[PDB]
Curated annotation (Swiss-Prot), chain A:
Subunit structure: Heterodimer of an alpha and a beta subunit. Interacts with HTATSF1 and GPBP1. Interacts with URI1. Interacts with GTF2B (via N-terminus); this interaction is inhibited in presence of GTF2F1.
Name of protein: General transcription factor IIF subunit 2
Residues represented out of the complete protein: 2 to 150 of 249
Family affiliation: Belongs to the TFIIF beta subunit family.
Modified residues (N6-acetyllysine): K21, K32, K121
Chain positions with N-acetylalanine modification: A1
GO cellular component terms, A-Z: microtubule cytoskeleton; nucleoplasm; nucleus; transcription factor TFIIF complex
Swiss-Prot record, chain B:
Localization: Nucleus; Cytoplasm; Chromosome
Source taxonomy: Eukaryota, Metazoa, Chordata, Craniata, Vertebrata
Post-translational modification: The tandem heptapeptide repeats in the C-terminal domain (CTD) can be highly phosphorylated. The phosphorylation activates Pol II. Phosphorylation occurs mainly at residues 'Ser-2' and 'Ser-5' of the heptapeptide repeat and is mediated, at least, by CDK7 and CDK9. POLR2A associated with DNA is specifically phosphorylated at 'Ser-5' of the CTD by CDK7, promoting transcription initiation by triggering dissociation from DNA. Phosphorylated at 'Ser-2', Ser-5' and 'Ser-7' of the CTD by CDK9 (P-TEFb complex), promoting transcription elongation. Among tandem heptapeptide repeats of the C-terminal domain (CTD) some do not match the Y-S-P-T-S-P-S consensus, the seventh serine residue 'Ser-7' being replaced by a lysine. 'Lys-7' in these non-consensus heptapeptide repeats can be alternatively acetylated, methylated and dimethylated. EP300 is one of the enzyme able to acetylate 'Lys-7'. Acetylation at 'Lys-7' of non-consensus heptapeptide repeats is associated with 'Ser-2' phosphorylation and active transcription. Regulates initiation or early elongation steps of transcription specially for inducible genes.
Protein name: DNA-directed RNA polymerase II subunit RPB1
Organism per entry: Homo sapiens
From Swiss-Prot, chain C:
Protein name: General transcription factor IIF subunit 1
Source organism per UniProt: Homo sapiens (Human)
Localization: Nucleus
Signals that turn on the gene: Up-regulated in response to enterovirus 71 (EV71) infection.
Disulfide bonds: none
From Swiss-Prot, chain E:
Sorted UniProt keywords: Acetylation, DNA-directed RNA polymerase, Metal-binding, Nucleus, Transcription, Zinc, Zinc-finger
Zinc finger extent (C4-type): 6-31
UniProt xrefs under SUPFAM superfamilies: Zinc beta-ribbon
Gene Ontology MF terms in the entry: DNA-directed RNA polymerase activity; nucleic acid binding; zinc ion binding
Similarity comment: Belongs to the archaeal RpoM/eukaryotic RPA12/RPB9/RPC11 RNA polymerase family.
Organism: Sus scrofa (Pig)
GO cellular component: a single term: RNA polymerase II, core complex
Protein name as it appears in the record: DNA-directed RNA polymerase II subunit RPB9
Length: 134, 134, 108, 87, 114, 147, 195
């Protein structure tokens, strides 16, 4: 028991966690409110020999997100948190990885172009003046 | 063509198919089952090497077509090795009847009785492949 | 049985702020990291540079056990975010952003 | 070059730090470029046509201006920031 | 041929015999660690190196639009008529004119030589 | 030579602002990957193939003496163009060289060690492929390779 | 934008992958920097080509090369790359149609131009590196017409072979009937000809 001790209780309980890679538009929609305690619903449907994962965007938030799983056997991942009280802890071991992909194919590129323009706004370019300074 | 063969330059590297440094601590029980068939012929009445044998072994397999092209049979190669290295090395070669031409090599008995018993084999094999002249 | 056709759907919660920040701890598979022997551990900022902008040093089971070094992922996720889903008694998934990513490698 | 590289070079140029006590910081922000101009001996600017440049052995060049922000920290707990437009 | 790494420090293991028992042990360096060497062969090089080029061939080459396609050599595994044939074009062969064939059917990366 | 032809052929690196070449495994150690398995994970991506594994043995043997990142950094600093008066300064100089002078296009920030190690391993992998004959040597006259 | 799109799609960052996965996956390089790895290189290349031909997230001059044998995808965006326009061929058929030709015939008073061809994705710019992986057809009427199957996977078609010539070599009449050093000599002389 010391300041530098790591609370491995999560590892002892073998708590399983899932890691997901999600896009900026989804993360930013969540960050907009970020305090309502709700952003959507994750629906998992399993069949005889196939499982599908999907996420539904909240109706209020919007004003389908299929999930593709990834093998985690090539790398072992764990999650640890640094508490504000300087009490490091382990939450669990990553047992599954997933990626969230957009549904729209072409019209989504329109939003991507808008994002690119927004990111290019800070870019500054030489300006053609008219009338020499004096 | 006989004069051409006597004039051109040929190195163990040209007539050797492959080389392998086996451990083979017991010559009577060879790690290579194919070797054990004929190695025991030499080791039934061994001569000039019964005193001691270096644990390590250097097995070289020679290409039949190259051997026939250069008219180099299994005898003069061992004779050249013996002349070059004095008694430093003991060479035991198979017969042409076997589909594979094999020449096992070991370090002298006296040294066994300072550089390294292992790396020195890599030294001799590479120098035999390039520096030595058949 | 129900396992062959079970459908599970859970709410998603994203608290605005959390007292403890969330990080990622990645171990190489070939290292064969095992937590059964992790009776105790010590994670602290390094002293070679001699704080928030420095690598992390992990010493498992004091000096006797293995030592690992974690380095912040230089590549930033300007267009990506990572979240962790954890089981809770209320049955709703909770998503926490990944503040940092660390790759730990054992030190002989 | 004119639209991207000049401005990017000026931006990437590290801010000038001086101290020898008060310390001054110089930052180059924006690039401005006027039309090619020629100054007569009297000092009156006038647009320079390429044919005029060819005939009079002039250089077809455009004046270049930078916005420069100079911030002075006097160690007195106040910093004075003055911007020179189109230097 | 195999390369073994120390279980303690994940460093290269070098061969050393033990005179006490006269057996090969892959011993670590800067670690004071040892292992029992089951394989026995510590070094082997093939000068001729008749390496099977089929191992190097990648099934994805069937997607290359620049490779020729022939329907006279059907795939044995699935019977697909169309196939892509090419030469090795890899150094050290010293005789490279034979054709290696790859099935063009997706998901069947069968490769062979005539 | 006895040991020269026994170990084989080794890989060195001619880093900028360093008078003489250094073994590649030493560069990896300075970048901070000490274990031979970790370095070979970034160099060889498929441990199943033994032919490429045999190619890197002489380099590992040559770099066996240095086993610590700080030791490798001091080794590089000692051969830096501006020798450091003290070992700590030599380390500080070698780290700067490997941070901003080697593979700058990969990155110049402080936490680009992994990226630089991966790219250097890719360079070593390309060299090994060329030596093994699995890839054709680059053609200088090729224009896709001209700007 | 290229890096952002690659991150959006299933391209695993180098930092977030174990080395063992690099074997099967194809490396993804951008401007000579090993950005990451990908598992479906064919689909990734199809998506990138579609994006470039639609001018949505990839500009025309960006060159994407898939070394299938080496399992590499190199995307180049830096300046200085020499490239030329080439007509796109799909299923042994030009994407350039009589409607495009008529709109070009009425080039003025309708605002139609070459940029519209490029945007429609009938003609795209190819550099030397990408041209290594291209299956050119010298002419559409002859090489991709149903005939003895020399090749049925043509990817692009030359707009006109004579466009391989320069300004001074383009004034030679019937240069394909002259011994080449005479074409060179005329190229030299045309710069000294009066006019
Ligand atoms: Zn070890
Ligand atoms: Zn097939």
């Amino acid at each position: 028991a010391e300041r530098g001790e790591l609370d491995l209780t999560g590892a002892k309980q073998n708590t399983g966690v899932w890691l997901v890679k999600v896009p900026k538009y989804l993360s930013q929609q969540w960050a907009k409110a970020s305090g309502r305690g709700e952003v959507g619903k994750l629906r998992i449907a399993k069949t005889q020999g196939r499982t599908e994962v999907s996420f539904t965007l909240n109706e209020d938030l919007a004003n389908e997100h299929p999930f593709v799983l990834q093998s985690v056997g090539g790398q072992t991942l764990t999650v640890f948190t640094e508490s504000s009280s300087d009490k490091l802890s382990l939450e669990g071991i990553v047992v599954q990885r997933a990626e969230c992909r957009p549904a729209a194919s072409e019209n989504y590129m329109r939003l991507k172009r808008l994002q690119i323009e927004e990111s290019s706004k800070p870019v500054r370019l030489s300006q053609q003046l008219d009338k020499v300074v004096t | 063509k006989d004069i051409l063969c006597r004039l051109e330059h040929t190195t163990l590297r040209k007539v050797t198919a492959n080389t392998a440094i086996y451990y083979d601590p017991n010559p009577q029980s060879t790690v290579v089952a194919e070797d054990q068939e004929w190695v025991n012929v030499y080791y039934e009445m061994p001569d000039f090497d019964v005193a001691r044998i270096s644990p390590w072994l250097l097995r070289v397999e020679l290409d039949r077509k190259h051997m026939t092209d250069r008219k180099l049979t299994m005898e003069q190669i061992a004779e050249k090795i013996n002349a070059g290295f004095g008694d430093d090395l003991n060479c035991i070669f198979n017969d042409d009847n076997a589909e594979k031409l094999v020449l096992r090599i070991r370090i002298m008995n006296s040294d066994e009785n300072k550089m390294d018993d292992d790396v020195f084999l890599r030294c001799i094999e590479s120098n035999m492949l390039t520096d030595m002249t058949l | 049985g129900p396992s062959s056709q079970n459908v599970t759907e859970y709410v998603v919660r994203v608290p605005k702020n959390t007292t403890k920040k969330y990080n990622i701890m990645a171990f190489n598979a070939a290292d064969k990291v095992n937590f059964a022997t992790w009776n105790q551990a010590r994670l602290e900022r390094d002293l070679s540079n001699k704080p928030e902008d420095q690598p992390w040093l992990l010493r498992v089971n004091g000096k006797s056990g293995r030592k690992f070094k974690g380095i912040k992922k230089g590549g930033v996720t300007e267009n990506t975010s990572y979240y962790i889903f954890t089981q809770c008694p209320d049955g709703a998934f909770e998503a926490f952003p990944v503040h940092n990513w660390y790759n730990f490698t054992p030190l002989a | 070059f004119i639209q991207m590289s000049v401005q990017r070079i000026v931006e990437d140029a590290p801010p000038i730090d001086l101290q020898a006590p008060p310390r001054y910081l110089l930052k180059f922000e924006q690039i401005y470029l006027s039309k090619p101009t020629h100054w007569e001996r009297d000092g009156a600017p006038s647009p320079m046509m390429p044919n005029e440049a060819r005939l009079r052995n002039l250089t077809y060049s455009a004046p270049l201006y930078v916005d420069i922000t100079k911030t002075v920290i006097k160690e007195g707990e106040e910093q004075l920031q003055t911007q020179h437009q189109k230097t | 041929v195999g390369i073994r790494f120390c279980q303690e420090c994940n460093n290269m293991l070098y061969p050393k015999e033990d005179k006490e028992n006269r057996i090969l042990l892959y011993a670590c360096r800067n670690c004071d660690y040892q292992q029992e060497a089951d394989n026995s062969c510590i070094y082997v090089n093939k000068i001729t190196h008749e390496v099977d080029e089929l191992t190097q061939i990648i099934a994805d080459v069937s997607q290359d639009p620049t490779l020729p396609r022939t329907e006279d050599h059907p795939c044995q595994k699935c019977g697909h008529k169309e196939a892509v044939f090419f030469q090795s074009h890899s150094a050290r062969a010293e005789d490279a004119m034979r054709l290696y064939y790859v099935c063009t059917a997706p998901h069947c990366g069968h490769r062979w030589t005539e | 030579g006895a040991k020269k032809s026994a170990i084989g052929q080794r890989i060195v690196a001619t880093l900028p602002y360093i008078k003489q070449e250094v073994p590649i495994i030493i560069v990896f150690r300075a970048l901070g990957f000490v274990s031979d398995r970790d370095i070979l994970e970034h160099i060889i991506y498929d441990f199943e193939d033994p032919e490429m594994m045999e190619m890197v043995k002489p380099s590992l043997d040559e770099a066996f003496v240095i086993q610590e990142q700080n030791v490798a950094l001091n080794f590089i600093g000692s051969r830096g163009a501006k020798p450091g008066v003290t070992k700590e300064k030599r380390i500080k100089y070698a780290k700067e060289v490997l941070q901003k002078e080697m593979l700058p296009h990969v990155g110049v920030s402080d936490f680009c060690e992994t990226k630089k190690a991966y790219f250097l391993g890719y360079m070593v992998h390309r060299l090994l492929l060329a030596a093994l004959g699995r890839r054709e040597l680059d053609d200088r006259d090729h224009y896709g390779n001209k700007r | 934008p290229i890096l952002e799109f690659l991150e959006e799609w299933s391209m695993e960052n180098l930092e977030e992958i174990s080395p063992a996965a690099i074997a099967d996956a194809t490396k993804i390089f951008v401007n000579g920097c090993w950005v990451g790895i990908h598992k479906d290189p064919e689909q990734l290349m199809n998506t990138l080509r579609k994006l470039r031909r639609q001018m949505d997230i990839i500009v025309s001059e960006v060159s994407m090369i898939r070394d299938i044998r080496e399992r590499e995808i190199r995307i180049y965006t830096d300046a200085g790359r020499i490239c030329r326009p080439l007509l796109i061929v799909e299923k042994q058929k030009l994407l350039l149609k009589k409607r495009h030709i008529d709109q070009l015939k009425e080039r003025e008073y309708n605002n139609y131009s070459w940029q519209d061809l490029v945007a429609s994705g009938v003609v795209e710019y190819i550099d030397t590196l990408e041209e290594e992986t291209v299956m050119l057809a010298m002419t559409p009427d002859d090489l991709q017409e149903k005939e003895v199957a020399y090749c049925s996977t043509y990817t692009h078609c030359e707009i006109h072979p004579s466009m391989i010539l320069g300004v001074c070599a383009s004034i030679i009449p019937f240069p394909d009937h002259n011994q080449s050093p005479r074409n060179t000599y005329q190229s030299a002389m045309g710069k000294q000809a009066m006019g």
